[PDB]
């Protein structure tokens, strides 16, 4: 399990993408292929693409 945390709110523009809030946690499922990552939200359980610069690794896992 790879956990990341959002540093900013983001509002999806493509139906394949998650919308989220600063502070939300994500299990990353694939780091691409490309600069959008497949992720499951730990808040809502939804799966989709997130922009990689909106998130950062959690401190320890």
């Amino acid at each position: 399990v790879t956990l990341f945390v959002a540093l900013y709110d983001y509002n999806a523009t493509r139906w394949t993408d998650l919308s989220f809030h600063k502070g939300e946690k994500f299990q990353i499922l694939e780091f691409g292929p490309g600069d959008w990552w497949e992720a499951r939200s730990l808040t809502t359980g939804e799966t989709g693409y997130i922009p990689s610069n909106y998130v950062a690794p959690v401190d320890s896992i």
Partner: protein
């Protein structure tokens, strides 16, 4: 499918419903192109997939259902999540489907078969029927217009050789969340794969142009 109608049950026997498991499962459409191969979009990939053929109401098990595990996922090697270029995947099933009135294969096109803007096509699926509405229990279909590539210019690196531009923007009819991976048919041939569009469901949406991928499909089928 937004602005569509319920299909005549089992009238599109190639339709596949995908349950993708990662925890909680996601859902997509797809369609049977060989007895053991389902075509879908690349962004529907996951750790394990179950395909249900022969369904109309996806919540009611019926006589016509055939329910098969996927044993191998063939995602296009150049798929990219920034652009969603090459949003195409072939799924190899654990066993061959039986051809019945309610389960059948859909022909896919020659690479020379380049479908121009202006014509009406049909797409089907079990996706949401509105921005905030649930997935449809029953298979739904809508007739949409092929648009000039200029009308999809708001989408990133939209490439007319790779992608179709689908859905008259003056109307609300559109594919949407959950429809991804489903076929677009023009005059009975699979021309397009529902790929993506706007979060607010305003048409047009982007479909993968299957004709471009004919050689890639060939190489997967012949090796498998």
């Amino acid at each position: 499918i937004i602005g569509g109608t319920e299909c005549k049950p089992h009238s599109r026997p190639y339709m596949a419903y995908l349950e993708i498991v990662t925890g909680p499962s996601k859902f997509c459409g797809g369609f049977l192109i060989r007895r053991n191969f389902v075509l879908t979009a690349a962004h529907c990939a996951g750790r394990s997939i179950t395909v249900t053929l022969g369904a109309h109401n996806i919540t009611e098990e019926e006589d016509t259902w055939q329910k098969l595990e996927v044993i191998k996922q063939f995602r296009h090697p150049k798929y990219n999540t920034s652009t969603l270029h090459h949003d195409i995947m072939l799924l190899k099933l654990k066993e061959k489907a039986s051809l019945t009135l309610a389960v059948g294969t859909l022909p896919f096109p020659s690479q020379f078969n380049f479908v121009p803007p202006g014509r009406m096509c049909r797409v089907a699926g079990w996706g949401r029927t509105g921005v905030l509405k649930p997935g449809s229990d029953t298979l739904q279909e809508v007739k949409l217009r092929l648009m000039d590539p200029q009308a999809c210019s708001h989408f990133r690196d939209f490439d007319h050789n790779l992608q179709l531009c689908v859905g008259n923007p003056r109307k609300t009819k559109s594919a949407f969340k959950g429809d991804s991976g489903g076929p677009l048919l023009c005059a009975g041939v699979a021309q397009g794969i529902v790929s993506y569009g706007r979060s607010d469901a305003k048409p047009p949406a982007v479909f993968t142009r299957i004709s471009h991928y004919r050689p890639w499909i060939n190489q997967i089928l012949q090796a498998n």
